[PDB]
Amino acid sequence: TFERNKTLYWGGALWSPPSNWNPFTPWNAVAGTIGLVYEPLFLYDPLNDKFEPWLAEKGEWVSNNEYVLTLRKGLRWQDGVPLTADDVVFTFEIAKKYTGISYSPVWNWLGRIERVDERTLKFVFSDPRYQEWKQMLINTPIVPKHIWENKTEEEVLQAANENPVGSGPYYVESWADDRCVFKKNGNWWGIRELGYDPKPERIVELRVLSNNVAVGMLMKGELDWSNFFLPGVPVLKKAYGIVTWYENAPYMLPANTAGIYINVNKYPLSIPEFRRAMAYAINPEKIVTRAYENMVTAANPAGILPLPGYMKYYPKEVVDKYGFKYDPEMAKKILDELGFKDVNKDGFREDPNGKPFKLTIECPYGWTDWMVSIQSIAEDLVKVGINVEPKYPDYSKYADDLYGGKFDLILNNFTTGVSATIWSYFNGVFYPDAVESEYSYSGNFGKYANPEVETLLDELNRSNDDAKIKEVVAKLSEILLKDLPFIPLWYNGAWFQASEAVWTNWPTEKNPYAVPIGWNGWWQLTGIKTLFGIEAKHH
Numbered sequence: 001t002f003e004r005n006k007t008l009y010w011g012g013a014l015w016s017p018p019s020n021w022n023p024f025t026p027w028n029a030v031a032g033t034i035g036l037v038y039e040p041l042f043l044y045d046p047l048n049d050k051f052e053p054w055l056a057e058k059g060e061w062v063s064n065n066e067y068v069l070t071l072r073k074g075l076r077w078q079d080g081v082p083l084t085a086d087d088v089v090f091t092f093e094i095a096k097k098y099t100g101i102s103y104s105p106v107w108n109w110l111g112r113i114e115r116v117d118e119r120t121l122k123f124v125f126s127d128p129r130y131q132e133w134k135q136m137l138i139n140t141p142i143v144p145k146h147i148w149e150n151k152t153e154e155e156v157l158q159a160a161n162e163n164p165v166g167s168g169p170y171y172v173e174s175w176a177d178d179r180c181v182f183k184k185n186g187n188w189w190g191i192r193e194l195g196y197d198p199k200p201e202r203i204v205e206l207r208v209l210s211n212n213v214a215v216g217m218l219m220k221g222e223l224d225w226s227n228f229f230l231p232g233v234p235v236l237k238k239a240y241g242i243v244t245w246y247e248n249a250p251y252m253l254p255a256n257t258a259g260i261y262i263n264v265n266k267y268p269l270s271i272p273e274f275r276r277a278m279a280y281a282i283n284p285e286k287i288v289t290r291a292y293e294n295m296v297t298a299a300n301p302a303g304i305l306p307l308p309g310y311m312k313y314y315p316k317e318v319v320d321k322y323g324f325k326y327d328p329e330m331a332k333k334i335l336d337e338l339g340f341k342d343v344n345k346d347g348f349r350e351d352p353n354g355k356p357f358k359l360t361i362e363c364p365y366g367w368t369d370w371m372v373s374i375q376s377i378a379e380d381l382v383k384v385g386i387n388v389e390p391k392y393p394d395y396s397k398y399a400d401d402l403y404g405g406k407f408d409l410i411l412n413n414f415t416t417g418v419s420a421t422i423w424s425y426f427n428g429v430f431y432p433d434a435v436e437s438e439y440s441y442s443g444n445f446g447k448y449a450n451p452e453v454e455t456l457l458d459e460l461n462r463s464n465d466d467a468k469i470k471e472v473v474a475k476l477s478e479i480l481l482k483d484l485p486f487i488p489l490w491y492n493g494a495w496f497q498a499s500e501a502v503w504t505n506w507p508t509e510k511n512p513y514a515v516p517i518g519w520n521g522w523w524q525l526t527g528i529k530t531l532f533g534i535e536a537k538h539h
């Protein structure tokens with residue numbers, strides 16, 4: 001049995017049976033595969049807007065189109081093989097050869113990677129996409145050449161990669177239908193080279209079928225670290241000693257923009273004015289109150305996260321002029337203009353030819369707050385005569401629906417999260433390559449096309465000037481508000497609560513040494529630093 005005071009029980013990110021640890025497919029890999037096992041060149045600290053060199057010792061643009069990366073000495077894979085610049089070169093170059101790899105488009109703007117010396121690389125760009133490069137530095141996991149280099153593309157993309165060999169502080173000890181057990185690598189290079197020493201001997205990542213199940217686990221100290229949404233936080237804190245980021249309401253940091261992606265290839269969702277009608281029909285405040293007990297705030301119409309590094313580009317003129325707000329009369333007005341009228345007194349508008357139509361809205365089953373939220377959204381839409389039914393596929397079906405574009409309306413936040421650049425938000429909304437691609441893992445899940453938007457995304461991407469960025473953000477926001485491929489509704493929380501029954505010194509507002517979120521994508525946003533600060537109450 002695992003000794004209690006050396007074991008960290010964590011959940012909130014495991015919504016399918018653990019079966020994949022492939023760093024090339026983080027959408028399917030067990031959360032923590034990126035972070036615990038495979039590592040990035042840099043972390044990004046969103047609390048302070050700062051990069052922390054991780055595998056890298058340093059990185060800088062030495063010219064308009066050359067980025068010099070210096071790797072730390074003494075880096076090592078979990079199998080003892082040195083991790084070197086060879087592996088970084090390979091991580092990028094494998095995607096030149098194998099276009100099926102998700103980040104293969106990097107080679108449309110990266111020209112070559114020069115080896116300067118033993119630990120230094122010079123990335124030379126044909127098209128220096130500064131904003132997108134920031135994201136690559138924290139999101140691209142470095143993989144071992146000596147393990148992956150002889151695999152075919154099918155092998156690379158399909159491999160379950162059981163017993164993954166990464167360079168990180170934990171490896172996989174065991175797994176089963178309800179858990180993945182990570183075990184500490186006592187020889188992790190980071191101990192010597194960074195002076196970080198992860199405290200848990202084991203991290204047990206738990207799966208539950210619904211947030212409902214996690215409540216009792218946290219209450220009883222069976223769960224230490226929760227990245228679940230849990231209701232009734234005031235009671236958890238008062239009666240069970242639960243800690244959160246903020247001591248008082250709203251308790252939770254914002255994490256991302258939750259909104260509705262719309263299948264623009266399904267009638268009548270193809271009609272931009274119909275999408276604007278839906279936006280006017282929805283009451284985000286009812287969601288904020290009913291689902292979240294005011295732990296979140298409603299989104300501004302552009303969906304720009306209420307953080308300083310984003311809000312410095314807020315397009316107030318554009319939003320004042322082109323924004324939407326909750327107004328059922330305006331929704332009814334537009335629907336009537338479009339000819340969608342109830343001809344049979346069933347409370348549902350038929351189409352202009354008198355035919356019925358109805359739509360689905362979906363979220364993952366067991367994501368209890370999103371279930372309540374899409375019930376609320378559906379109710380709002382039905383109230384102006386749009387027949388919308390909530391559906392709760394399991395996470396895996398939800399994800400296949402999302403990535404494959406097989407939905408009507410879908411509540412999502414996967415690409416609209418906290419990042420090093422506002423470019424990632426607009427890319428997460430508009431991702432042009434989604435349109436012709438079978439699956440999209442990068443955004444624009446409803447496959448909205450707009451050639452003008454593509455040029456603007458690139459303009460923003462290529463800019464390093466605040467004035468220029470502000471100008472382009474305004475143009476992008478105007479098109480977002482006119483065509484609404486994505487309807488922003490609220491900022492979903494960075495859900496974090498912890499039990500102090502075993503582990504203490506959690507990071508909080510007053511002790512902000514890490515952002516304690518272990519969802520995929522968040523280890524590199526300093527989730528990993530959680531592990532070096534927590535303290536086991538008892539030896």
Ligand SMILES: OC[C@H]1O[C@@H](O[C@H]2[C@H](O)[C@H](O)[C@H](O[C@H]3[C@H](O)[C@H](O)[C@H](O[C@H]4[C@H](O)[C@H](O)[C@H](O[C@H]5[C@H](O)[C@H](O)[C@H](O[C@H]6[C@H](O)[C@H](O)[C@H](O)O[C@@H]6CO)O[C@@H]5CO)O[C@@H]4CO)O[C@@H]3CO)O[C@@H]2CO)[C@@H](O)[C@@H](O)[C@@H]1O
Binds near residue numbers: 013519
């Ligand atoms: O409140 C509701 C419930 O919340 C639960 O917790 C949720 C949480 O709220 C949130 O939904 C979270 O979402 C995860 C998600 O599960 C998934 O892991 C997701 O993974 C993303 C990832 O963040 C990136 O967006 C990634 O984008 C990359 C692309 O895949 C691709 O590699 C791309 O490659 C480009 C390349 O880098 C280069 O730029 C080149 O030029 O072009 C390439 C192509 O574009 O690079 C992208 C960026 O790196 O995609 C994946 C998949 O979309 O990450 C989010 C965020 O964490 O999930 C959790 C649950 O796990 C619970 O709290 C529950 O209790 C609540 O009820």
Ligand SMILES: [Mg+2]
Binds near residue numbers: 237242
């Ligand atoms: Mg307290």
Ligand SMILES: [Mg+2]
Binds near residue numbers: 346
């Ligand atoms: Mg009718």
